[model samples]
Target: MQIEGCVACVTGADRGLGAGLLEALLERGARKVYAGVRKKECLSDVGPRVVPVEIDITNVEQVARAASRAKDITLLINNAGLNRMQPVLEAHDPEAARAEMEVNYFGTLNMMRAFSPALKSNGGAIINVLSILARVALPSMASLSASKAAALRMTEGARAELAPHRVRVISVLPGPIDTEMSRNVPPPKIAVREAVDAVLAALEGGADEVYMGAMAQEIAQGLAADRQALHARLLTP
Candidate 1:
């Protein structure tokens, strides 16, 4: 789909990949971009072409309100997600896991459901920002990985379901992006700009799935080759 002249709504536009996507969408000449954030204050400087919608994806009411407000949107970018680190055993915190799933998985689902009508009305597309961990689960991040995996699966399922309506569903898996979230980990890192560029490229090319970083693509390939070996490596630490 063409980026220019498209009306897009991006979730989690306050910072990180979501912010990057909002910037990139504007830079690519999107007609109007609706930035969905929990707080309206954070979007003060987003300018006229971008509309700030108060959207807490986990909250169904807010999501529906945002969707209703952005009815003209042709593209829905589901970028709101959370990462929680904890072993399912010790972390016996169902709340923690539930929070992650509510946002990462169900949040995306809620947005998709809310926007399905608008998307169908305009023959739009849905972009889901997933993670490399979706394919390879680590011991320390079991909850996060599982949540992302569920999101990825939902993306695929949505794609199949929305096909008849001509609403394209795309999944983007990025790895080790040079954002605040990755600062705690060791480099080499992929530039955020480059990752966003890859995302745009994928969207332009009409790809159903995109692995943005080299590390992400490598991990995907490795896991495809030998799931057991990749699991062993992740647990080796």
Candidate 2:
């Protein structure tokens, strides 16, 4: 009954992995899905169990409205994030790093803060889609890795705070996903469907966090052993 009867909500639900998550949720027999999207019109075909919500995660007021509208929500997915493949020192746009943090870290913070009341009341779960890059900052994508790392730490705090309220916070750290964001990155990529299944499995098993793909787990281990070596491998391809 953990996921089947739960009312869920997915951000970035119109395309790619987000869309895949929505489908998997419905397949698992979730009661409803509040699909958060920047463009409301994009969700017209996502089906009836889904309630299309216009939300810009960065806009506190907008996502707060979503929390109000989807009061029955017990599962929240913070999957909306911006990625930049630029190094910190060599980036053309200096403000680019802020944009990644705004969407990846602060944006997730906004959704959680607004939904805390509702999630507490319903005893829901929050799944934050993170990356293995969070464990190690790569020069190929310095700012993005830093932002995800911030989200990882934030996920820990949320898990501790929400535990008493019976809200489960799940942090999903995946290696390179086969999406437009990592189009240029090489193999050992996880398919969207595989990652979606992993998330659902964790949700049902009552896990606090889960990793997708072998590489995700491997690099995470290396971070403690030899982060400097991880730096080389992450940037090699």
Candidate 3:
């Protein structure tokens, strides 16, 4: 779908990649952009074209409400995510793993379900911001990887379901990004602006899925060349 003249909604727009996406949408000439956040105060001085909507995607009520208010939106960017950094075993909080799944997978699903109808009616698109971790698990971030993997599957399923509606569903799998979420991630992290630009580039190219940054591309290539070896390597501590 064309970015110009599109009305878009971006979850977690207060910071990180979500904030980058919000700006990119505006730069791409989106008519209006709704910035979704947990607190309205999280966003200020964004100007009139940008609407700050208080929405915690995990809250079904809030998701529904935001969908209602942003009915005119032609694009929905599911950028909200949670990474608890807990491994599957020897973990401190089991609930953190559950929370990761709730936010990264189920929360995204909630937004998709709530806004899908409007997207179908308006004939637009949904962009799911996933992780390259979705394709490979790291022992240090087992639970986070699992949640992202589930989200990737959910993105594909949503794509197929929304295909007939003429609503495009795109998945963005990026390697470690230089954001608060990836603060612990080692160097070579992709800049937020670069990631945002790649996402918009993919949308304009009409791709079903795109991997941003060199790290993401390399990992994808590694998997393709030697899935078993790469999986074992990534899973090793």
Candidate 4:
């Protein structure tokens, strides 16, 4: 469960939490990392322990091909996401909404499908970096929220399916992080370091789900205490 001495493959490892995962893994004694990225240019600054792999998670053939070479991965972190903050009503381009589903939902599904057998071979954990929005829709990020909600359900289903195989599947739902993706997401965002710390701690603690920061934690607790009220708060102005 601990990252130390684990061979992990982290999607979207070029930057943000994906990059943080790679950095933390290496620092915490990871053996090697298959760093998935769409552009080779994104990995210019990444260290040598990382093996840059061209991965377009939307393409099934590409992910299948990528999965073929990974025989030793003990941990898989599905961190790639597309956060196009467009309201459902205001979005002029329908493809933009679909694109969010392509990346945030289907993309993660591709990774899980591709990596499941590899993980089963060696036994490991699959970590899906979701969002607190998965449980509630935001006006500005309706599509992103819906996609993450689907991913969350998929993560739960995968967890149940993989349990007999001893593959622990965990989903991380954080409110917001101070990263390039969340530049326009407003305040109450946790530091990149803080979010990463929570993720690592959760993995080592053998957690099935992790809610990062005060906002995320509160939302999680609120849901358990009163589901209807939590939804009311989320939808209220």
Candidate that would win on lDDT: 3
lDDT of 3: 0.90
lDDT score of residue 168 within candidate 4:
91
**Model 4 root mean square deviation, Cα atoms:** 1.4
> Candidate 1 deviates by what RMSD?
1.6
lDDT of 4 at 165: 93
The global Cα lDDT (0 to 1) of model 1 is 0.87
Estimate the TM-score of every prediction.
0.94, 0.93, 0.97, 0.95
Candidate 3 local lDDT, residue 90? 73
Error of 2 at 225 (Å): 4.1
Flag the better candidate by lDDT, 3 or 4: 3
Clashes of each: 0, 0, 0, 0
lDDT of 4 by residue, 97-170 (tens): 89999999999999998899989889999889999989878878898999999999999999988999989999
**TM-score between candidate 3 and the true structure:** 0.97
Please give the CA lDDT of all the candidate structures: 0.87, 0.86, 0.90, 0.88
Give candidate 4's whole-model lDDT: 0.88
Most accurate candidate by TM-score:
3
Residue 216 accuracy (lDDT) in model 1: 88
Q: After aligning candidate 1 to the native by TM-score, how far in Å is the CA of 147 from where it should be?
A: 0.3
Tens-digit lDDT track for model 2 on 1-237? 367877988999988789889998888888898888999888755677888999999998898888889888888989998888888988988999999999999999999899889999978789999887787777878899999999999999999999999998989888888888888899768899998888778776755668788988888678778978867876785
